[PDB]
């Protein structure tokens, strides 16, 4: 039953990031399931972390990490006695790649390509290791490596969704004073960046207020309030800024909004926030970018709008708010879909990968043997 799993996170936890958060959530989840997990990462002295995460330090023409670091890592692996070593974003250079090169046996590496989709593969430890390791260094930064990995022979590469704790949203406490009889709409992100599409949401505001005069636009994330109020004109009174909040409050605000609007001009990454919205039971209206269309399943799980279309956005929102049955339907379907993104599933898939790669009696060792 039980398994010992090392994970390597290339990034310090001193700063928020998708990968860091992914790793930690996953680790917690596996530990909850009765596995021994160890997390290696760079020094994160500023934040208080669980006891199973370990620090490797920080350091970096073309140059590599210093000796003390290598020592630390080798120690970690050798005394780890891991059944599986899981590496994240083994970009070259990185802590992860260092680990990947140091170790031997059941090695798995994951590249998080989109916030909602992540490629997972097993390193060739045969005569090809030197060659494959150079390909793995470029997967992060190139389409061709990615392709070749998914396409090639003897390559076990699989795609798995990004994980989410669904309950932390669904069960999130409502914000004091919500729901608003005035119909709140949620925007989430840094609104000074045009690709987040705040401008579109602003363009559609007059119609929205016309048909729903008491509406609030709840805005989470960092940006310039003054400027936006100024661009909002006399409708600026409808805006409410929560600033850049913690995850708990994000979940709360998300759950207490009647609708989540995602008018992104494009990211080709950003989609996971929609998953969080659906898990919160809040109906989604999103721009028609491919990723969003995938997540909402062609328009099954949420309303899709043409990119950079204000009139469409307005019609969509208004339509959602005015008819409650429709909205409820959208939410229910979304709740159906959100299953595949929960950790209990994702963790199972990755566990399958672990089980495939690791045998009985085989432990991760430092090269060579």
318 annotated to a ligand binding site: no
* Residue 250 DSSP SS3: helix
Q: Is 36 annotated as a binding residue?
A: no
Resolution in A: 3.2
DSSP H or E run through 127: none
**Is 247 within any annotated ligand binding site?**
yes
Cβ pair 77, 85 in contact under 8 A: yes
SS (H, E, C) 93-156: CCHHHHHHHHEECCEEEEEECCCCEEEEEECCCCCCHHHHHHHHHHHCCCHHHHHHHHHCCCCC
Is 269 annotated for ligand binding? yes
Region for residue 127 given its phi and psi (left: phi exceeds 0; alpha: psi -120 to 50; beta: otherwise): alpha
138 annotated as ligand-binding: no
**Close Cβ partners of 14 (under 8 Å, ≥ 6 residues apart):** 43, 44, 45, 46, 47
The residue extents of the domains of the chain are 1-164+342-369, 165-341
Tell me if 18 is assigned to a ligand binding site.
yes
Residue 341 is labelled as binding a ligand: no
347 assigned ligand-binding residue = no
3-state secondary structure of 210: helix
Q: 303, 328, 307: which is closest to 317 by C-alpha?
A: 303
Q: How far apart are CA 101 and CA 77, in angstroms?
A: 12
Q: Confirm or deny that 344 is annotated as ligand binding.
A: no
| Nearest residue to 334 (alpha-carbon basis) of 264, 247, 262 | 262
Q: Give the fold, CATH level 3, of 1-164+342-369.
A: Rossmann fold (3.40.50)
After which residues do gaps appear in the chain, with C to N over 2.5 Å? 60
**Residue with the two structure tokens 């970018």:** 289
Give the residue from 351, 363, 362, 364 showing the smallest Cα distance to 1: 351
Q: Does 327 show up as a binding residue in the annotation?
A: no
Say if residue 96 carries a ligand binding annotation.
no
Report how this structure was experimentally obtained.
X-ray
Q: Is 268 annotated for ligand binding?
A: yes
Cα–Cα distance measured from residue 177 to residue 175, given in angstroms and rounded to the nearest whole number: 6
Q: Is there a binding annotation on residue 271? A: yes
Domain pair 1-164+342-369 / 165-341, same fold: yes
Q: Do the annotations mark residue 20 as ligand-binding?
A: yes
Contact 165, 145 (CB under 8 A): no
Give the residue from 223, 234, 295 showing the smallest Cα distance to 260. 295
3-state secondary structure of 236: helix
In what order do the strands lie in the sheet containing 303-305? 239-243, 217-220, 185-188, 259-262, 283-287, 303-305
165-341: which CATH topology?
Answer: Rossmann fold (3.40.50)
How far apart, in Å, do the first and last CA atoms of the chain sit? 27
Q: Residue 59: name the closest of 73, 79, 48, 76 by CA.
A: 73
Three-state DSSP state, 283? strand
Is 111 annotated as contributing to ligand binding?
Answer: no
The SS3 call for residue 93 is: coil
Tell me whether residue 74 is annotated as binding: no
- What is d(CA 110, CA 90) in angstroms, rounded to the nearest whole number? 8
């Amino acid at each position: 039953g039980a398994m010992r799993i090392g994970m390597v996170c290339p990034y310090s936890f001193d700063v928020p990031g998708g990968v860091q958060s992914h790793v930690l959530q996953l680790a917690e989840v596996l530990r909850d399931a009765g596995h021994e997990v160890s997390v290696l990462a760079p020094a994160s002295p500023h934040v208080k972390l669980p006891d199973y995460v370990v620090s490797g330090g920080k350091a970096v023409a073309r140059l590599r990490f210093g000796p003390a670091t290598h020592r630390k890592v080798k120690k970690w692996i050798a005394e780890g006695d891991f059944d599986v070593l899981h590496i994240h974003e083994p970009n070259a250079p990185s802590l992860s790649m260092l680990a990947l090169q140091a170790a031997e046996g059941p090695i798995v590496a994951t590249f998080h390509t989109s916030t909602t989709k992540s490629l997972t593969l097993s390193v060739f430890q045969g005569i090809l290791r030197p060659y494959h390791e150079k390909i793995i260094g470029r997967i992060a930064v190139s389409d061709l490596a990615r392709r070749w990995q998914m396409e090639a022979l003897g390559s076990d590469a699989v795609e798995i969704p990004n994980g989410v704790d669904v309950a932390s949203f669904a069960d999130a406490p409502l914000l004091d004073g919500y729901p608003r009889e005035g119909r709140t709409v949620l925007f989430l992100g840094r609104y000074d960046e045009p690709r987040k599409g705040m401008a579109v949401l602003l363009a559609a505001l007059p119609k929205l207020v016309a048909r729903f005069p008491d509406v609030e636009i709840l805005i989470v994330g960092r940006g310039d309030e003054d400027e936006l109020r100024e661009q909002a004109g006399d409708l600026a009174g409808h805006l409410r800024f929560l600033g850049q909040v913690d995850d708990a409050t994000k979940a709360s605000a998300m759950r207490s909004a009647d609708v989540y609007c995602a008018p992104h001009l494009g990211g080709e990454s950003f989609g996971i926030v929609l998953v969080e919205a659906m898990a919160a039971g809040t109906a989604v209206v999103a721009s028609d970018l491919d990723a969003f269309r995938r997540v909402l399943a062609d328009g099954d799980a949420g309303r899709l709008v043409p990119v950079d279309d204000a009139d469409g956005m307005a019609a969509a929102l208004i339509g959602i708010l005015e008819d409650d049955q429709l909205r409820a339907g959208y939410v229910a379907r979304a709740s159906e879909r959100v299953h595949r993104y929960d950790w209990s599933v994702v963790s199972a898939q990755i566990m399958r990968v672990y089980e495939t790669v690791s045998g009985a009696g085989i432990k991760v060792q430092v090269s060579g043997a």
